[PDB]
Ligand binder design. Sequence first.
Ligand SMILES: CC(C)CN1[C@H](c2ccc(/C=C/C(=O)O)cc2)c2ccc(O)cc2C[C@H]1C
Ligand SMILES: CC(C)CN1[C@H](c2ccc(/C=C/C(=O)O)cc2)c2ccc(O)cc2C[C@H]1C
Lengths: 242, 242
Amino acid sequence: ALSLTADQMVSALLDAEPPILYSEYDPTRPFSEASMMGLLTNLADRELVHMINWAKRVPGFVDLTLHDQVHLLESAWLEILMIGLVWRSMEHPGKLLFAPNLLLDRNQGKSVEGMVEIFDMLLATSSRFRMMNLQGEEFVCLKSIILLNSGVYTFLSSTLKSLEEKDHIHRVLDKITDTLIHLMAKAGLTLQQQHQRLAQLLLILSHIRHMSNKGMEHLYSMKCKNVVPSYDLLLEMLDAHR
Amino acid sequence: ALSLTADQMVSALLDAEPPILYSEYDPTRPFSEASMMGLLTNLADRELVHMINWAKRVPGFVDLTLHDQVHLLESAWLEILMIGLVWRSMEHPGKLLFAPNLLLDRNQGKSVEGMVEIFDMLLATSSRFRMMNLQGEEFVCLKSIILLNSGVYTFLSSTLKSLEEKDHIHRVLDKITDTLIHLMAKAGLTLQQQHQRLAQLLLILSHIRHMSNKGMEHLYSMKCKNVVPSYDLLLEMLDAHR
Ligand SMILES: CC(C)CN1[C@H](c2ccc(/C=C/C(=O)O)cc2)c2ccc(O)cc2C[C@H]1C
Ligand SMILES: CC(C)CN1[C@H](c2ccc(/C=C/C(=O)O)cc2)c2ccc(O)cc2C[C@H]1C
C-alpha cells in the first residue's frame, strides 16, 4: 500500500467501488403504505455488507488488526453511507438519490420526525459538491480518508501495536493526500489552487462528521436492538475465513 | 481581509488571541465541595464573552451580516472552546488545563456521568497535537477555520445575499489555507510535506467536530435554560452599538 504510485492508488480505489443498490419495495404497489424509515433501514443494511467488502479493498486497511478494522468501520459507517448518498445525488438538484428507484425530496423527509433536518444538511452537501465540481477520482479518495481517519483518534490504547497501527494509518492517509494533489495537478490546477482545493475538500468532511452524529442520535433514540450494527455484527462480517 | 498578505493574516490572528482565564473557586476552600460541572460551566460562560470579541477581530468576519455571524458562532462555539483547551493542555500529558488553577486528569472527569468519555477524546487530541508538534501560528489559523467553516453548510438560504456571504467565507478560508502553507514553507518543509501537514491538520478538525457534538448532547440532556447560549444571547452580545 505504501509502495503504490498515485495512479495505482486511484485505480485500486476505483476498482474497489461498491455497486449502487436498489430499494426493496413493490413498484406496482401504492407508495403511501411503505415505511420510509423501513425502506431506508433495509437499504442501509444491504449497503453495509458491500461496505465491508469495499473496506477490505482499500489499500492498507487489511494490514491493520481485526479489532482496529472493526473500530474504524464502527466509527465511519454512517459517514460513508452519507458521502455515498451525496455523491449519487450531485446531479439531481433538490433530491436525494437513495437508489435509482428511490429519489426523494425534502418534503418526503417530513413523514418522519427529525428527518427533514437531516435531509436538508445532505442536500446542502450535494449542492456544495456541485459548486466545487467534485470528480469521481476525488470522491473515492475522500471516502477512503473517512474510513481511515474517523476512528484513528479514539483507539484509547497505547500498546506498542496500537502505536504502530496509528503510524501506519497516518502513512496511508499521507499517500491519499499525495494522490489527491496528483489528481489536481493533472487537471491543470496551479500549486495555489491545488492546496486551496485540497483544503476545501477536507473541510467538507467535518460537515459529513456532523451529519453522521446527528444521524446516530436519531438512530439511538429509536431504542432498538435491530438498529445500529453492533460491534459483534461488524466483527462477524469482517472476521472472514479463507 | 482578502487583500491581506500571509504575514499580515498571521499577525492579525495572533493579535486577536483571547486571554487564558482562571477558574472561579476559593483556593483556600476544600476541592471536594465545589461542583466540577459548575466550575466548567462558569469558565465556559466567561470564555464565550471573550470569544465574541475575538471573532469580531478575525479578518473577514465583521464583513458578514449579523445573522450570519450569529449562525457561525452558534455552530462553532464549543469546537472553539475545545480546540483552545486542547492547545493549552498540549505540554501537560495526561491532563486537561482548563485554567492555570484547574488542571484535571481523566479520573477527575469520572465525577460526572458521561464526562470521562469526553475527557478521553480531548486528551487524545492533545496527544495528537504533541505528535505533530503543532505551532502557535498554525493553531490560530485552525481556530479561525473552525469559526468560518463549521456553520457555512447550514445557512439553509439561497437569497442573493446568502450566496454572496458563502462566497466571501470560502474566499477568506482560501486565504487562511494560503497562510498555513506559507507558515509551513517558512519552516523549511518540502512541497510534499506541506500538503501532507495541511491535510493532517484539517483532518483533526473532523475529530473536533465530533467531540463538540458529543458535548452538545451532554449539555442538551441537562434540559436547562441556563445551559447552552441561545440565539438571542449570542445576537445580543454580537449586536453591539458604537
Ligand atoms: C437518520 C439517518 C441515519 C438516516 N440515514 C439513512 C439511514 C436509515 C436507517 C439506518 C439504520 C441502519 C440500522 O438500523 O442498522 C441507517 C441510515 C440512510 C440510508 C441509506 C443511505 O445510503 C444513507 C442514509 C443517510 C440518512 C438519510
Ligand atoms: C460536556 C462538555 C460540553 C464539557 N466541556 C466544558 C463545558 C462545560 C459546560 C458548558 C456549558 C456552557 C453553557 O451552559 O452555556 C460548556 C462547556 C468546557 C468548559 C470550558 C472549556 O474551555 C472547554 C470545555 C470542553 C468540555 C470539557
